[PDB]
Amino acid sequence: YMGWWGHMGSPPQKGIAGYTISPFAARPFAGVVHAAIFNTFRRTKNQALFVILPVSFFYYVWTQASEKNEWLYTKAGRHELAKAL
Amino acid sequence: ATTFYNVFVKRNSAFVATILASAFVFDMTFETAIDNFWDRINAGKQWKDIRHKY
Amino acid sequence: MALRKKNSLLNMANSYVLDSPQPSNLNYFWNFGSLLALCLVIQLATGITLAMHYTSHASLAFDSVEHIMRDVNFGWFIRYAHANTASFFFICIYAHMGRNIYYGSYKTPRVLPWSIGVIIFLLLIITAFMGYVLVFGQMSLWGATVICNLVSAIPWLGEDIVHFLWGGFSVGNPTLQRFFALHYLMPFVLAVFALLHLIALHTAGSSNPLGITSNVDKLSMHPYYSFKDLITVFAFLLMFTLFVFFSPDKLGHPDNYIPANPMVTPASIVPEWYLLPFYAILRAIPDKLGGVIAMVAAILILLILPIVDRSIIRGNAFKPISKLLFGFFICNFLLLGVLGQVHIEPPFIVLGQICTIFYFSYFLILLPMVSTIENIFFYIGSL
Amino acid sequence: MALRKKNSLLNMANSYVLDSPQPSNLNYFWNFGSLLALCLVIQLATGITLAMHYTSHASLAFDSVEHIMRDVNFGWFIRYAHANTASFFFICIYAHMGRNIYYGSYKTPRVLPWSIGVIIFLLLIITAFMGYVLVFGQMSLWGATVICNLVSAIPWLGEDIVHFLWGGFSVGNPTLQRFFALHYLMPFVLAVFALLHLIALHTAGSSNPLGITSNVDKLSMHPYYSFKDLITVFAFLLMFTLFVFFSPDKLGHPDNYIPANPMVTPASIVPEWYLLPFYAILRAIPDKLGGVIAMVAAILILLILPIVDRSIIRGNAFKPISKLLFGFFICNFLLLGVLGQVHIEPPFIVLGQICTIFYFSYFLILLPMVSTIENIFFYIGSL
Amino acid sequence: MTAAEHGLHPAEYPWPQNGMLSTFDHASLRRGYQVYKEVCAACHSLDRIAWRNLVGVTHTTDEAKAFAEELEYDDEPDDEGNPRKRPGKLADYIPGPYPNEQAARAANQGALPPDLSLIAKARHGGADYIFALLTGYPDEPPAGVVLAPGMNYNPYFPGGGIGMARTLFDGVVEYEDGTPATTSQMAKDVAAFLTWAAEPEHDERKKLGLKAIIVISAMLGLSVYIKKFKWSPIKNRKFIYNPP
Amino acid sequence: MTAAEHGLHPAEYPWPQNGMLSTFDHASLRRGYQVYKEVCAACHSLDRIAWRNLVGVTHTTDEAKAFAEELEYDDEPDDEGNPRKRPGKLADYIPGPYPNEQAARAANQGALPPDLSLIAKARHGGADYIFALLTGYPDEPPAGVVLAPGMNYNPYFPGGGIGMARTLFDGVVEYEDGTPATTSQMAKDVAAFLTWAAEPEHDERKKLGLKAIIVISAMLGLSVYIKKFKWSPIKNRKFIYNPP
Ligand code: HEC
Ligand code: HEC
Ligand code: HEM
Numbered sequence A: 001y002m003g004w005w006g007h008m009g010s011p012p013q014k015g016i017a018g019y020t021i022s023p024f025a026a027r028p029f030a031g032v033v034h035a036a037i038f039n040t041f042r043r044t045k046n047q048a049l050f051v052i053l054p055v056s057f058f059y060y061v062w063t064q065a066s067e068k069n070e071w072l073y074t075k076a077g078r079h080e081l082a083k084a085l
Numbered sequence B: 001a002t003t004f005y006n007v008f009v010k011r012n013s014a015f016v017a018t019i020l021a022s023a024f025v026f027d028m029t030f031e032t033a034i035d036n037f038w039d040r041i042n043a044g045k046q047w048k049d050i051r052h053k054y
Numbered sequence C, D: 001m002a003l004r005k006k007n008s009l010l011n012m013a014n015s016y017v018l019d020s021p022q023p024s025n026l027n028y029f030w031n032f033g034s035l036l037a038l039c040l041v042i043q044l045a046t047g048i049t050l051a052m053h054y055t056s057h058a059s060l061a062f063d064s065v066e067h068i069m070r071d072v073n074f075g076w077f078i079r080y081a082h083a084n085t086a087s088f089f090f091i092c093i094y095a096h097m098g099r100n101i102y103y104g105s106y107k108t109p110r111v112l113p114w115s116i117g118v119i120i121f122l123l124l125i126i127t128a129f130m131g132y133v134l135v136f137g138q139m140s141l142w143g144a145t146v147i148c149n150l151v152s153a154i155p156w157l158g159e160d161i162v163h164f165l166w167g168g169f170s171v172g173n174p175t176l177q178r179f180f181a182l183h184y185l186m187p188f189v190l191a192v193f194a195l196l197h198l199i200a201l202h203t204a205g206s207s208n209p210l211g212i213t214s215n216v217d218k219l220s221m222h223p224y225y226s227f228k229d230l231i232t233v234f235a236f237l238l239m240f241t242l243f244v245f246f247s248p249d250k251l252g253h254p255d256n257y258i259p260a261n262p263m264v265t266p267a268s269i270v271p272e273w274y275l276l277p278f279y280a281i282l283r284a285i286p287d288k289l290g291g292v293i294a295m296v297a298a299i300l301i302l303l304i305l306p307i308v309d310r311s312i313i314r315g316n317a318f319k320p321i322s323k324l325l326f327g328f329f330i331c332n333f334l335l336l337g338v339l340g341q342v343h344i345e346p347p348f349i350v351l352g353q354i355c356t357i358f359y360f361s362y363f364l365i366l367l368p369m370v371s372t373i374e375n376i377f378f379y380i381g382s383l
Numbered sequence E, F: 001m002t003a004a005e006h007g008l009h010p011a012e013y014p015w016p017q018n019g020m021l022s023t024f025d026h027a028s029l030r031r032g033y034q035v036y037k038e039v040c041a042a043c044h045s046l047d048r049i050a051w052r053n054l055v056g057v058t059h060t061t062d063e064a065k066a067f068a069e070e071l072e073y074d075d076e077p078d079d080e081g082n083p084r085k086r087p088g089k090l091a092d093y094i095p096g097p098y099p100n101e102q103a104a105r106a107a108n109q110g111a112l113p114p115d116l117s118l119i120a121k122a123r124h125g126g127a128d129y130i131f132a133l134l135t136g137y138p139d140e141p142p143a144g145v146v147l148a149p150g151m152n153y154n155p156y157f158p159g160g161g162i163g164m165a166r167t168l169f170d171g172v173v174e175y176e177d178g179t180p181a182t183t184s185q186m187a188k189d190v191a192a193f194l195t196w197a198a199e200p201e202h203d204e205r206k207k208l209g210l211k212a213i214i215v216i217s218a219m220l221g222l223s224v225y226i227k228k229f230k231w232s233p234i235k236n237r238k239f240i241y242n243p244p
């Protein structure tokens, strides 16, 4: 499924013209400030839920479990610990 | 800029020689600079600072 | 013809590091492969150097490690580099495997590099397990004892196999000397399998974040990905620097600075952090043999991803529901890791069982269901 | 398409061990390559096993070898197999190199496999030198001392380099522990170079005893050469059996059963037999640095055979004068070996110098002259 | 587990060596050596430290040679093969109070005082744990705590009952530099000294770390420039498509 | 070198163990143990041999336990950490006559009697050298030989002057099996015993060798048949050429 240069396995290409300029002719950091702020904000906003939802759920579950475990091993939690074991 | 390019950059042999010479100088000067800075932020704490009492 | 292409030896190197045609749109998650190569090179360099100063005999082992720390020039650095890079090796390998699962790198035509990859991961685990025993501190000894006693669960022959592994009736000098020899060897085996999985990959080439063919638009490995890999090499070296020079013991267990004592049992025997999720899976099953099977199955089940993923599309970039499921799967795997080092106490016991069920149900139920439904949604949604 | 050809991993194995096209007329001197592979496999298996029972610390090293001999089940066999196979490795390598020189295997288009072969030979020498030190008997210590002091001849920095190699001011514990780590490593390096020289060979294929092309008449590697290689595998195992089981110490020095003692100097410090010719060459030159250079040059000069052989015909099968010269060259190399273990006494001193001159004059004078004259004799003789 | 079973967590004290660019205070190290020597060394060894280790850290070559030369160590046997002693040298290790574990336990009601060479790394908390433990013996155990025989209450110790009694009291040591030897001062000095003993590369390691951080950061910045420079023709590529 | 500097080469004696299929004579091994124990052990150790090694070779389990139990070995310290002795066990090594080299040399006019556990492998000649040396002290040194003080003439020893005197004389041992204890008999038995001590796998090794030889020879024969079978189409190939 992959060939090599000259016969890479692409369907025939035709009709596309590609253009570019030398690295010495270009500003490598052109538009860096706009990208760093606006592009990153757009990219982050669109992915935020896929991180927030699972992280917040599993952090909540952990927090509840760790707090219960702590409470069960106090004096106040003696009776509930006895039942839990 | 032309002169500088022509002497130090154009020939890779010269470019590599200049990079290695610079690395040598950097290495020696950076050592000395860090040593002095480290001694100033940790002044009075090191053996070299209390050695004179003994 | 250029010499790099004409000469057969040069041409093999050329094919992997220079002319190798790569997709033009690999993101920074494609940098973990070369970081893993860097960890391997550091472990070989530091490990062979430690082997010049270490003594594998149980009467001298722990003291030889103190001699390295105290007397060998830069011995402290070489030891801390080796110990911390073992952790970084696992961070990079989990990132690399996470990328592979998210982007569908296990799908045809890349089943074979993925399957060899699963073996690489098992070899890493064994290598790191044996290396940790070599210190012969309290955790070294007691971790070896508990982990090797899992083999006793093998029916009929299990006990005999354990005595054979130990070279005696408990973990002692014979065990330590054999772990040294095998710890030295296993990284060479691992380097071979790493090379094999890249040769297998080279038939299809790298996948890419869109999941489509890159045969339409290729870039040479050098200079593009060479220079992209340097960025993460230096990011890695900065992380490495902060641990090795400023916090060299953060990732370790203080009990491993106590010499092994078969009489005294440490308060808690836990594996190194990178093994913790597998340990939580083992604890979840009450049966001894059950627990062992589940723990092995938790790794071997990666081999069925090419089958249970029913999607007609490679990878998750365009699959919102798959992305959510993947996020839950990852966070569950981290929670299993945390539960691997809590005490066996309520309510962590039941939590560990629910998380274990979710871990397996991702492969067996959820991914096949979600991938089936998304196929239908793509087709109906775009009619 | 057959799977062996279709699958890229299988296809690489296929290319070397199965479909590999070979000349149909290889004689039994083409069997040494697979015998060398067998020696390497035995050394890896026995060496890794010894490493599970050996202790590299100078206070325990010699005793760990006695523990292997006396207490480890079949330890005596594993140790004797490892020690004797080191000798067999050199017998096979000299036969293999002898075949290559007689049959013109170093000529174009096989300069590159021959040149990598010269490095393999150097790596074998270093590997075996370090392995012998590990016993830490009298010959181990004193041989390490005299051989490592040759480095002191390097001008200006020589003494500093020796102290750096030793890790101290004489051969001691630091030296032994580093030799263990490097002895473990070097065989893996040697296996890589062995593979490289076969990849380089695979472009031209094997030469054959007639020196002509075999592109006209090829045979698959399997089953023909597979089954031919088994004959010499069993012949080798019979020789191995007679040494390991019936005369396990014949090739060794009794002094290596005395523990290393820096005070007492053994009567005679000689290298292992397979290094003796190089030692005689070193002794021949009175100057220390001169002797070191000559000894290294005696191996590196193999690299110029592709240049000094002026023949238009590959190999010696049809060259009566070259065959006679080759016979003298071989017997001289054996005489140098014998002179490497005589005492520095008359008349062996002058004999060693004459044999040393003849060794070098084969490459520099005789082979270029004889090969030039034979070219003319073939042309005029067949007009 | 109960909090008692874990032991109370020690406060985070502001040690001089806390801080990416901070060394130990060598004057505190010297004072801590003196507390080890006059208090702890009665029960605890420091077996991984040789006299040469103190030189250029806490003491001069001559002071350390003087400490070594006051002791007797086993020499090689004489010519009749009889045992002999010699005075100590800089190469010698600091000798412990007991010949073996059995002697150590017999002197300490069954408990074995650990070697202190690694103790700062061998306990969660490090210097903070050592300082907290030494200064955290309450006059009276909390009501209800039943101590086993030969145990002392200390909340920092897991389980609460430790076989080591309180040993630091105001003025048990007279510091040679005139520092007032309070309980707190001696606990701070000895904790600093033991931290040094566990990690004597500390000062050098952190200075080399500073050099590494600077170089690696600069190289990271330059590698970003160079990557972006080389990639700009790809990033800037434009296409015009005319369907055939 | 002169022949004197090399030492005379020992005769080749026909040992029972010479011979591809021959074991040691175990009765000679037992007698040789008794010579070691009653003569050599005054000056020479056998440090690599444990009591368990004799069992099923020269002695029964009970005889060897009896030898071990007659001696005292260092035990673990008692509860006050004081030294203790225990009776020997089968696991213990046979103890040597001297505590150290210095004591050994002091008892032997400066010479150090070597440990004999490996001596049969550590000398050219093996058993033949040991037998020749023990039986080769002439009554008088050859005229002209000047012995250094405390040296004895023995031509088998390189240089001729050995620090060990003749020790085997007719009837210094009374064998428990009734064999006449002549100089020659005792030298033969002790040489056999020391050869066993150097190579205790000997008997097993040679029997496994016999099995290996047989199997490998058969496999060599069959591999020749199979090679020739597979190659016969190539070897038998014939050509007819008709030039185009
Ligand atoms: C006379 C006895 C004695 C003196 C004096 C003494 N210790 Fe101890 N120490 C012990 C004993 C006994 C233990 C073991 C306690 C146990 O395990 O129950 C111990 C334990 C410790 C521990 C380890 C506690 C743990 O977590 O396991 C540290 C740290 C310690 N001592 C430091 C010191 C320091 C610092 C000093 C003095 C400046 C000191 N000790 C003085 C007897 C002593
Ligand atoms: C009372 C002293 C003494 C007795 C008894 C003794 N030896 Fe020795 N033996 C020595 C000394 C001393 C040497 C060292 C001689 C030297 O190196 O000059 C020695 C050396 C040897 C050597 C090594 C010679 C060499 O080549 O280096 C052998 C073998 C030997 N003894 C065997 C025996 C045997 C067998 C017996 C008795 C059955 C025996 N010895 C009895 C004192 C003794
Ligand atoms: C994949 C590569 C490797 C990994 C993941 C790895 C992992 C480890 C680990 C976790 C330890 C315990 C470290 C500690 O806490 O002190 C260790 C110790 C050790 N490793 Fe490795 N290792 C690797 C390669 C090697 C190699 C190639 C050698 C060559 C001998 C080696 C030699 C050692 C030695 C001698 C020790 C004991 C001394 C010490 O603890 O630092 N390692 N290794």
Ligand code: HEM
Binding pocket: C029, C030, C031, C032, C033, C034, C036, C037, C040, C093, C096, C097, C100, C105, C106, C110, C113, C114, C116, C117, C118, C120, C121, C190, C194, C197, C198, C201, C205, C206, C207, C208
């Ligand atoms: C020593 C450990 C490893 C090393 C050095 C290594 C190295 C690499 C490298 C350099 C690549 C190509 C660049 C990249 O995608 O990152 C790669 C790709 C890959 N690796 Fe790994 N790898 C290792 C372990 C693993 C493991 C454990 C797995 C799987 C469980 C795996 C599966 C893959 C797959 C499927 C690919 C192709 C991914 C793609 O381009 O789409 N590897 N590896």
Ligand code: HEM
Binding pocket: D040, D043, D044, D046, D047, D048, D049, D050, D051, D054, D065, D079, D082, D083, D086, D089, D124, D127, D128, D131, D132, D133, D134, D135, D183, D184, D187, D190
């Ligand atoms: C080309 C492969 C090798 C050669 C030529 C070789 C050669 C040698 C030699 C000559 C000795 C001295 C043997 C003796 O007289 O006792 C030796 C010892 C040793 N070798 Fe190797 N060796 C090889 C591979 C290995 C490997 C891969 C290991 C893995 C650790 C290893 C481990 C040892 C050890 C532990 C000893 C010391 C114990 C002993 O003397 O038997 N060797 N080797």
Ligand code: HEM
Binding pocket: D029, D030, D031, D032, D033, D034, D036, D037, D040, D093, D096, D097, D100, D103, D105, D106, D110, D113, D114, D116, D117, D118, D120, D121, D190, D194, D197, D198, D201, D205, D206, D207, D208
């Ligand atoms: C570990 C050591 C070595 C191994 C395993 C090895 C293996 C082999 C094998 C299997 C072959 C093809 C079959 C044959 O001709 O015998 C071969 C050919 C060759 N080897 Fe080696 N070899 C080793 C060392 C060397 C050395 C030291 C040299 C040269 C100084 C050398 C030079 C060559 C050459 C030139 C060939 C092609 C010969 C021809 O077919 O005409 N090899 N080797």
Ligand SMILES: CCCCCC[C@H]1C(=O)O[C@H](C)[C@H](NC(=O)c2cccc(NC=O)c2O)C(=O)O[C@@H](C)[C@@H]1OC(=O)CC(C)C
Binding pocket: C012, C013, C016, C017, C022, C026, C027, C028, C030, C031, C033, C034, C035, C036, C037, C040, C041, C191, C194, C195, C198, C206, C225, C228, C229
């Ligand atoms: C030296 C000749 C032997 C050929 C193998 C050498 C190494 C080799 O192939 O290099 C390449 C640089 C490779 N990276 C890639 O493919 C790559 C492809 C796409 C994108 C990126 N980066 C994106 O941003 C990549 O980085 C890599 O890191 O692989 C190592 C593991 C290989 O080492 C070995 O297997 C031997 C041992 C160290 C495991």
Ligand SMILES: CCCCCCCCCCCCO[C@@H]1O[C@H](CO)[C@@H](O[C@H]2O[C@H](CO)[C@@H](O)[C@H](O)[C@H]2O)[C@H](O)[C@H]1O
Binding pocket: D005, D011, D012, D013, D014, D015, D016, D019, D195, D199, D202
């Ligand atoms: C123990 C060693 C570890 C594993 C290494 C396996 C063997 C070494 C293989 C690396 C060499 C691969 O390098 C290349 O591979 C291809 C793929 O088969 C082979 O290619 C060769 O066989 C194929 C078909 O069998 C032919 O179409 C081709 O003309 C020929 O060159 C050659 O061998 C070599 O040109």
